[PDB]
Motif scaffolding. Structure first.
Motif, mmCIF file in Angstrom:
data_model
loop_
_atom_site.group_PDB
_atom_site.id
_atom_site.type_symbol
_atom_site.label_atom_id
_atom_site.label_comp_id
_atom_site.label_asym_id
_atom_site.label_seq_id
_atom_site.Cartn_x
_atom_site.Cartn_y
_atom_site.Cartn_z
ATOM 1 N N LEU B 119 18.100 20.332 58.077
ATOM 2 C CA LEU B 119 18.011 21.663 57.488
ATOM 3 C C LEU B 119 19.373 22.187 57.049
ATOM 4 O O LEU B 119 19.453 22.973 56.098
ATOM 5 C CB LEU B 119 17.363 22.630 58.482
ATOM 6 N N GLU B 120 20.447 21.760 57.711
ATOM 7 C CA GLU B 120 21.793 22.215 57.391
ATOM 8 C C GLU B 120 22.481 21.354 56.339
ATOM 9 O O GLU B 120 23.656 21.591 56.037
ATOM 10 C CB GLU B 120 22.653 22.254 58.659
ATOM 11 N N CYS B 123 22.229 23.579 52.880
ATOM 12 C CA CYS B 123 22.327 25.024 53.052
ATOM 13 C C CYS B 123 23.568 25.575 52.360
ATOM 14 O O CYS B 123 24.658 25.004 52.447
ATOM 15 C CB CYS B 123 22.360 25.386 54.538
ATOM 16 N N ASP B 125 26.625 28.309 51.538
ATOM 17 C CA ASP B 125 27.605 29.042 52.332
ATOM 18 C C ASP B 125 27.912 30.354 51.618
ATOM 19 O O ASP B 125 28.512 30.353 50.538
ATOM 20 C CB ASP B 125 28.871 28.211 52.535
ATOM 21 N N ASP B 394 25.619 33.530 61.064
ATOM 22 C CA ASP B 394 25.777 32.176 60.544
ATOM 23 C C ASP B 394 25.698 32.242 59.027
ATOM 24 O O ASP B 394 24.676 32.663 58.474
ATOM 25 C CB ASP B 394 24.706 31.237 61.107
ATOM 26 N N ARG B 396 25.361 29.932 56.961
ATOM 27 C CA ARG B 396 24.459 28.956 56.368
ATOM 28 C C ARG B 396 23.172 29.638 55.919
ATOM 29 O O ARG B 396 22.587 30.432 56.661
ATOM 30 C CB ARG B 396 24.154 27.840 57.366
ATOM 31 N N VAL B 398 19.427 28.845 53.823
ATOM 32 C CA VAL B 398 18.484 27.883 53.264
ATOM 33 C C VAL B 398 17.440 28.629 52.443
ATOM 34 O O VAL B 398 17.508 29.854 52.297
ATOM 35 C CB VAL B 398 17.818 27.042 54.368
ATOM 36 N N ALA B 404 10.802 23.624 53.158
ATOM 37 C CA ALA B 404 11.610 22.864 54.107
ATOM 38 C C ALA B 404 10.757 22.165 55.158
ATOM 39 O O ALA B 404 11.170 21.132 55.697
ATOM 40 C CB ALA B 404 12.632 23.781 54.779
ATOM 41 N N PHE B 489 19.208 30.416 57.756
ATOM 42 C CA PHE B 489 19.268 29.161 58.497
ATOM 43 C C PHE B 489 19.051 29.377 59.989
ATOM 44 O O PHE B 489 18.053 28.911 60.548
ATOM 45 C CB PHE B 489 20.608 28.462 58.256
ATOM 46 N N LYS B 492 15.583 30.923 60.750
ATOM 47 C CA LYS B 492 14.458 30.000 60.659
ATOM 48 C C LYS B 492 14.597 28.853 61.651
ATOM 49 O O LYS B 492 13.590 28.277 62.079
ATOM 50 C CB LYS B 492 14.332 29.469 59.230
ATOM 51 N N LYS B 493 15.833 28.510 62.028
ATOM 52 C CA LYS B 493 16.038 27.491 63.052
ATOM 53 C C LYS B 493 15.417 27.912 64.377
ATOM 54 O O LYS B 493 14.781 27.100 65.060
ATOM 55 C CB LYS B 493 17.532 27.215 63.225
#
Lengths: 43, 517, 506, 513
Positions: B119-120, B123, B125, B394, B396, B398, B404, B489, B492-493
């Protein structure tokens, strides 16, 4: 472009669900009697 | 024995079948009836499970899981909880296949660890970008995901104000988000597009006297009235214990009133000596003290809650006053303009306090045309400071929307054939059940579930872009990058990890003993 | 779709069919008989009707909240708000089930129709503003539109001059508390009087004169009931009753000192919030000052706006605060109970309208007519745009909805046209109470607007198509926008229900 | 007492919802793509699963009189079409629903609504007559069009996927009857077991009986005789007689006279010169051995329905009063042998003297298909027999209802007035019949029907709806065509029955006894 749908009655399985469950109880009966490793019954 | 497995699964399948239509922006709403008859219409699965008759303990565990998930992002709650319910059907077949429940739970944990690195990969920035692109990304990120109900048509008016509200509370040094500083109001009347944003604190309660002037004029100060918070009750001093006053003469009985008449004068004079104008307190007022309060041009409000005084103390930047002896000029507040407006027709008024300089108190005026919308607005109005809190923690970023989940499923499926053993039918069963989120989007949008997987497989596999997903808005492209569908990110993580951690328990349930309540 | 929404469609229509007879100026009033207290109320407005009726359908209770929105904003003709949403539920029974279209797509068809409806209401609005000469004269005919929807319409021409002069005395006052509506039993609706002043239902004292000229009126929040209440937890410690008899008697003179402070003001009239003991009441007779008591809360508030005074608790300074003056305070007995008639107020700060009727049900119900009519006059002053009602506005919007359906096309046109057909059923229901031909009147009105004539409309008195400008049918843009925008979004939430969850009763 | 009466307020709403509630079960049974239903009987715990509402609605108890006349008129449909006749109740329910919405909007008197359906039915008969095609002028295309007529009428049961195997059954069987409209001539036998496609058409007769003891299972060149005389029970008399005897000597002589009674009876049977004998009742042991001594076959226990079908198929005649041997006729078959069909072996006949009738062998998987194939074959050749009488046909399958809508819409312009609302309501309700048909297959009833509606107004008669592919296809290419006599009775009876139901202003419920 979506369109599609075509649902109307939202429970088409409702009539065909419990009947499979009633048939599964009959189906699970022969599963124990199937094969030489199976079991017998008494009526 | 094993007959209890289907008892817990079918109980979750009945709940998942109800909320199946609740997924996606095209979903539908459930009516929540209280035992007293109050109606609540919302799409949030946590609120539906909050008030409901629940038997199995699994439904109560979904509420505990939703508590940590609602504190992360705050949107698409239906598109999260139901994902863990689909794993019970895949685990039900593994029970028929003879796989041990612990081997099923440990299989779902190892397959979820590979989803972190996948997932990263792509992603974006947002830390390298300036604050201009940070506001442009956050503005169009929620518009698709945020509104599931009602105002989600006109939500563009709410999205523009939601971005300007965080800029005032968040300093440019690093990024910091506090969602307790901004309150949430609501009104019944008018239209949903009339919502406005004022910088300051807004009290819903109005003045306690009819002849109090609504609007105040500027003065020699900051142009504010120098608002001050008085915690001490407004009244003559009353000993908390009993008091016996011996009266030996008519004068001693008459001077008892002269005391409180002088206390009402000294209480008001201390406001005029310091220069304050509007002074509010927690308690009520007397009959005779309201006359001298009005003649001195000193608007006041009574029965003010303690929660409202918190945002008021930030706008005034003063100190809490425990007793009348602490009144001073240096302890007075600083405000710009304060206006009072009557709303529907005869409805009561509200004090809107404006701050010229940038402050940490921002109150967004809310208006709605139905009471059921207002109860629905509680969830709908403010998701923002929860969503941006994941972006600021974070950098990051997505793209969500069901894209995903299919990409990470094919990555684990390829890694499943490398381990072989019992991890083949295990990991593949986990990745195959992760497509229910885009498949449910195909139910509302009316797309073929078979063609859904074939479309994303012919793109996200060959092409490294994973943004290909289900389009429920009826446009000419499935790319989420062009359609501006953005999910955080780290936010959703947590939605993926907390959904897999739920299976570490339910899958191991064998015997259940319920003692009398 | 079938078991999910069942009573949400027919059940909501059955509720609207009960109030169907209440819609329109030719409609009739429904009797509300409560199962408890053995009381009754006769009201046309659905705010009270939908509130007191038991509703088993949760969707019907939602129609009460949207009715309360139009109750405060408009309050008149609110029946068509829930009826218009009921027609959208009838068309949804087909397009969702028969045509097999997802409910959100049907909602999206109404979402694009709601945006097109707002464009038709703004462009068709007529601007009446600027000079107040022809404006105020037009307010006579503009008010008559929404003035009487009841069977009381015989009072139209009579109350038309009273409602016009009511805002004239306010001189731009937008507060509905500045007007005083008096409900008196007996007489006729044509016997209503309008004077400059206030008429109180109380009386003067025993020896108070019946006529006093150039009287100075002053109110207050104090309590003259007896003695002094002082603070909490008091008591009297004395050696014998010699000092106790003096303490009780001296405070009667101490209150006289406060009355002596009243005499320093030179007021000819005094008004107290609470009851007054006989001794301070007789002291007002020696000074020749009228007395008024027994005012809970709004008793002193309604008179403060008319006299323009201020509540004085301390009575300390005969300089600051306010002193009100009325030319003639004479007591005038109207009907049975004697009334206190004030005249010659210091300013036009407030006004009072006196109403008389034989039936008590007419007083309470017609109070909402003038209460809502003055709100319309305040909206015509703020909002400068007005439209034309009488069934014409629904056909004008239908022209814009059908025009947008040609641009969208696709399968959403079935939902867009159904919204136009729902707008066609409102004048059918509007003309259903009069008992005239629907196919004849609607076809003449619908085809005339497509020909470029926007001035036509439904006339239920003569049963034909007449000009709404000649008959004096005018609706303000604030009234029309609030009804259409709320009713379009009212059914939007009702169509989002995919399941019914019934909680266990307590 | 206890008489509950409903005035025009309650009776108008209750009568319309009664036919709609029960009518929802027969809406999904329309067309070959229609579904079936299940009924749970409280007696014997039986059930009937079929798409024909004649055996469904009859066994469903209902307190609404509105559907009572719909069940009685199903017998008329059972005497004409017999398959897919539920559209009569569906169309009538639509006429009641549209009129319920017509009185709530137009608010005209109900008698005026009926007058609109009277003028609308006249325009429907003109569209069916002008579109009637008669292919009977060419005998080559006539026999080929019977297959196309069959493919439309022979798709009812779940087994309609086997129609390609069953099309040859009704094609050759209607040619063997040569004008026989009676089902008593048609021999229909049920057999449990075997594949679904094992059903074949054999020339002869199939008997489920057997031979008692010594009768050879294979007899060639035999004379078949049918007799109603009594054998098994013998002496049974029924006179005013009584028995009195002095000694047991004459007692046995009565039994000896019983032998002489049968010996003289078999002597008259022996004069017939027959190798095969059939009785309506059972055969006693003594004449059973006499049949084997003279080389005569024995068949017993032929009921009233089976005793006729023996002579009707073979062309024979039931013979009684043996005193006239040469005054009657004897049936003849080429090969008489016992075969085995399924578990129970059957007696097969071959080379019948008269080919006026044929025997259809029916083998199926389950007992549910036995009565299901009986309903599909209840009217099969009789439908083809009515096409032999009335040879005018018109393309069916949902398009003919759309063709009549163009004639009703054209007549509505000449009428106009306030009666055209009921005329247009009949056209709107008629176009909803193929819409429900498209709903049964799960296909699109919106865009497809909208295109079929404009296609009829464009002048294309052959345009229709394709059931398999769910698209617009010509009925002449698919082979879907129906006779003019059947469809005329369906549309007319549906409108005539709807006129009576709209006239009910009162419902009186008497106290049950």
């Amino acid at each position: 472009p979506s369109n599609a749908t075509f649902k109307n009655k939202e429970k088409p399985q409702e009539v065909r669900k419990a009947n499979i469950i009633a048939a599964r109880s009959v189906a699970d009966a022969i599963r124990t009697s199937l094969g030489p490793k199976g079991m017998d019954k008494m009526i | 024995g094993l007959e209890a497995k289907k008892s817990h699964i079918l109980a979750a399948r009945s709940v998942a079948s109800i909320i199946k239509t609740s997924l996606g922006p095209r979903g539908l709403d459930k009516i929540l009836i209280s035992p007293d008859g109050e109606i609540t219409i919302t799409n949030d699965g946590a609120t539906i499970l909050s008030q409901m008759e629940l038997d199995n303990e699994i439904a109560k565990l979904l509420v505990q899981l939703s508590k940590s998930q609602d504190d992360e992002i705050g949107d698409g709650t239906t598109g999260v909880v139901v994902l863990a319910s689909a794993l019970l059907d895949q685990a039900l077949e593994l029970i028929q296949k003879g796989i041990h429940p612990i081997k099923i739970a440990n299989g779902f944990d190892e397959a979820a660890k590979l989803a972190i690195s996948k997932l990263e990969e792509t992603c974006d920035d947002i830390s390298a970008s300036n604050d201009e692109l940070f506001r442009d990304f956050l503005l169009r990120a929620a518009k698709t995901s945020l509104g599931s109900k009602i105002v989600s048509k006109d939500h563009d008016r709410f999205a523009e104000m939601a971005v300007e509200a965080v800029i005032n509370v968040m300093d440019k040094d690093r990024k910091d988000v506090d969602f307790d500083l901004i309150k949430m109001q609501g009104r019944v009347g008018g239209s949903i597009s009339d919502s406005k944003l004022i910088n300051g604190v807004i009290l819903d309660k109005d003045f306690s006297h009819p002849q109090m002037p609504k609007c105040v004029l500027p003065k020699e100060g900051s142009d504010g009235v120098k608002l001050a918070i008085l915690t001490c009750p407004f009244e003559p001093p009353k000993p908390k214990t009993k008091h016996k006053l011996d009266i030996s003469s008519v004068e001693e009985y008459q001077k008892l009133q002269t005391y409180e008449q002088d206390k009402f004068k000294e209480m008001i004079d201390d406001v005029k000596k310091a220069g304050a104008d509007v002074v509010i307190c927690q308690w009520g007022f007397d009959d005779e003290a309201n006359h001298l309060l009005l003649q001195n041009d000193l608007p006041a409000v009574r029965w003010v809650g303690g929660q409202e005084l918190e945002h008021i103390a930030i706008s005034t930047n003063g100190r809490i006053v425990p007793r009348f002896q602490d009144l001073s000029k240096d302890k007075l507040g600083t405000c710009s303009r304060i206006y009072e407006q009557e709303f529907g027709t005869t409805k009561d008024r509200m004090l809107i306090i404006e701050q010229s300089k940038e402050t940490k108190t921002v109150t967004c005026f809310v208006r709605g045309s139905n009471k059921m919308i207002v109860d629905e607005a509680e969830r709908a109005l403010h998701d923002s400071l929860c969503v941006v809190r994941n972006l600021v923690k974070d950098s990051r970023v997505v793209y969500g929307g069901g894209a995903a989940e299919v990409t990470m499923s094919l990555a684990v499926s390829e890694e499943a054939d490398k381990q072989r053993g019992i991890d083949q039918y295990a990991f593949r069963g986990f990745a195959q059940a992760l497509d229910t989120i885009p498949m449910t989007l195909a139910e509302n949008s009316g797309l073929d579930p078979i063609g859904t997987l074939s479309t994303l497989k012919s793109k996200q596999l060959k092409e490294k872009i994973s943004n290909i997903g289900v389009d429920c808005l009826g446009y000419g492209s499935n790319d989420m990058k062009e359609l501006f569908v953005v999910d955080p990110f780290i936010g959703k993580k947590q939605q993926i990890l907390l959904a897999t951690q739920l299976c570490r328990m339910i899958l191991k349930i064998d015997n259940v003993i319920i003692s009398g309540k | 779709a079938e078991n999910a929404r069942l009573s949400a469609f027919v059940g909501a229509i059955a509720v609207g069919d009960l109030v169907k007879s209440t819609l329109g100026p030719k409609g009739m009033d429904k009797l509300l008989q409560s199962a408890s207290s053995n009381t009754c109320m006769v009201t046309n407005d659905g705010a009270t009707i939908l509130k007191s009726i038991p509703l088993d359908n949760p969707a019907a209770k939602v129609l009460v909240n949207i009715s309360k929105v139009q109750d405060d904003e408009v309050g008149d003709g609110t029946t068509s708000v829930t009826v218009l949403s009921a027609e959208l539920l009838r068309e949804a029974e087909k397009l969702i089930d028969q045509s097999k279209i997802h409910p959100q797509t049907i909602i999206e068809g109404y979402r694009l129709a709601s945006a097109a409806a707002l464009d038709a209401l703004t462009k068709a609005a007529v601007d009446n503003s600027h000079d107040k000469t022809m404006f105020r004269e037009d307010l006579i005919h503009i008010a008559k539109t929404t003035l009487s929807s009841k069977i009381l319409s015989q009072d139209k021409d009579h109350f038309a001059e009273l409602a016009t002069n009511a805002i004239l005395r306010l001189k731009g006052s937008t507060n509905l508390e500045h007007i005083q509506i008096i409900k008196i039993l007996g007489g006729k609706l044509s016997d209503s009087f309008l004077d400059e002043g206030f008429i109180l239902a109380k009386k003067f004292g025993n020896n108070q004169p019946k006529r006093i000229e150039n009287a100075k009126i002053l109110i207050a929040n104090t309590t003259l009931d007896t003695d002094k209440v002082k603070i909490f937890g008091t008591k009297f410690k004395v050696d014998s009753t010699a000092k106790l008899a003096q303490l009780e008697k001296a405070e009667r003179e101490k209150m006289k000192n406060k009355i002596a402070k009243i005499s320093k003001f030179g007021i000819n009239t005094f008004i107290n919030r609470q009851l007054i003991y006989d001794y301070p009441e007789q002291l007002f007779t020696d000074l020749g000052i009228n007395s008024i008591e027994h005012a809970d809360f709004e008793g002193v508030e309604r008179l403060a706006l008319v006299t323009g005074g201020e509540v004085v608790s301390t009575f300390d300074e005969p300089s600051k605060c306010k002193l009100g003056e009325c030319d003639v305070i004479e007591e005038i007995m109207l009907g049975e109970q004697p009334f206190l008639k004030f005249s010659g107020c210091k300013a036009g700060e407030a006004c009072t309208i006196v109403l008389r009727g034989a039936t008590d049900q007419t007083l309470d119900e017609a109070e909402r007519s003038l209460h809502d009519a003055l709100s319309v006059l305040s909206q015509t002053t703020k909002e400068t745009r007005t439209v034309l009602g009488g069934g014409c506005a629904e056909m004008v919007m239908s022209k814009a909805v059908d025009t947008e359906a040609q641009n969208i096309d696709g399968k959403k046109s079935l939902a867009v046209e159904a919204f136009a057909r729902a707008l066609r059923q409102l004048p059918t229901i509007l003309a259903d109470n009069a008992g005239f031909d629907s196919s004849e009147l609607v076809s003449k009105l619908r085809s005339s607007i497509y020909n470029g004539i926007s001035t036509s409309g439904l006339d239920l008195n003569n049963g034909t198509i007449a000009d709404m400008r000649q008959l004096g049918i005018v609706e303000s843009y604030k009234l029309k926008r609030a009804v259409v925008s709320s009713a379009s979004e009212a059914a939007e939430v009702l169509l989002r229900v995919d399941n019914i969850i019934r909680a266990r009763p307590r």
